[PDB]
Structure 1
Amino acid sequence: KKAQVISPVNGDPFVGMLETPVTSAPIVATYLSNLPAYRTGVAPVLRGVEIGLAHGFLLAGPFIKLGPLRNVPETAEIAGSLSAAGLVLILALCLSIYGSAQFQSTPSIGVKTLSGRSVARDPLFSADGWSEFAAGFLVGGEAGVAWAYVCTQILPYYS
């Protein structure tokens, strides 16, 4: 009756996260580590660009296919792309003011990597890093909304 799966976090039973397959499966850990959010050495502007492209491309679909002009043939895609552009703009604003509100106290404790080696803090989690991250998010999100429209126009099997 050996081989229990669920373990305390980094073996610490008093921190309270309970490492688990959904948390620390190597496929899951790999996928989440490869996401631009957790690429702590890469410049925050470029991670923001990638995140924004993804999100602007994805959140145009709902506005296109479910918006108020979804039943107008050529106007549905334009209206949805513009709604998504507006939402991306609002989100960039929210990101900017979050960077203004959050990064003022400069935490002093260091970080480790569940292995023992201390790493530097993510430059994303600074005022300048988050400002450039939000700039990248805006650029990438508007670019991804435009690309969502372009895909509405050029993809063969778009309904």
Structure 2
Amino acid sequence: SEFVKPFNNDPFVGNLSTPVTTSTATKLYLGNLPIYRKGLSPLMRGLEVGMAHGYFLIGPFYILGPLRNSPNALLVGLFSAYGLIIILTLALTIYGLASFQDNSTGSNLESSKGWRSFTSGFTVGALGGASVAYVLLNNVSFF
């Protein structure tokens, strides 16, 4: 009872159709993640990715930062998250500039306009997510 078969019935492609690669759970989770979800605009993809990453980026800096044992621990963590997000979106912009040099299609992550929209969504979402995480950690007594 074989469970590892050729990828898309192609023995000569460098891949295997394992349970990890091809199972229904993997397909569902991957295809429903924002980067692969159907119908989402590049702005919406970038926005979702941005809030998801900016929400959790604050935590390492807040807990394990140099000023963890200081009254300004959370503020310093938020500023660190903002700086890291600035670096991340600068990386995104230069990546778009290097990769999608000539393009006129748009509405596609592999085009200049689409990648710019994705980066804009990522920046706004990450800033908002870091701010929301700051608010939650300030009001941690609620939970």
Q: TM-score, normalised by structure 2?
A: 0.91
1:78 aligns with one of 75, 78, 93:
75
RMSD: 1.8
What is the distance in 2 between the residues matched to 1:47 and 1:35?
A: 9
Identity %: 48
- Kept in 2, the 8 Å contact 1:40–1:123? The answer is no
Q: How many residues align?
A: 141
Offset of 1:32 from its aligned partner? 0.8
Aligned structure 1 segments of 4 or more residues deviating by more than 4 angstroms: none
1:31 counterpart = 2:29: yes
Which amino acid in the other structure matches residue 28 of structure 1?
T
1:131 counterpart = 2:110: no
Which amino acid in the other structure matches residue 128 of structure 1?
K
Counterpart secondary structure, 1:156: helix
1:146 counterpart = 2:123: no
Q: Structure 2 matches for 1:1-159, cutoff 5 A?
A: 3-72=1-70, 74-104=71-101, 123-156=108-141
Structure 2 runs not aligned, ≥5 long: none
What is the distance in 1 between the residues matched to 2:138 and 2:84?
A: 21
When you count helix as a share of all residues, which structure comes out higher? 2
Q: TM-score, normalised by structure 1?
A: 0.82
Offset of 1:104 from its aligned partner? 3.1
Which amino acid in the other structure matches residue 141 of structure 1?
A
Structure 1 runs not aligned, ≥5 long: 107-121
- Kept in 2, the 8 Å contact 1:52–1:138? The answer is yes
Which amino acid in the other structure matches residue 64 of structure 1?
Y
What is the distance in 2 between the residues matched to 1:52 and 1:85?
A: 12
- Kept in 2, the 8 Å contact 1:8–1:16? The answer is no
What is the distance in 1 between the residues matched to 2:142 and 2:19?
A: 37
Counterpart secondary structure, 2:43: helix
Offset of 1:79 from its aligned partner? 0.6
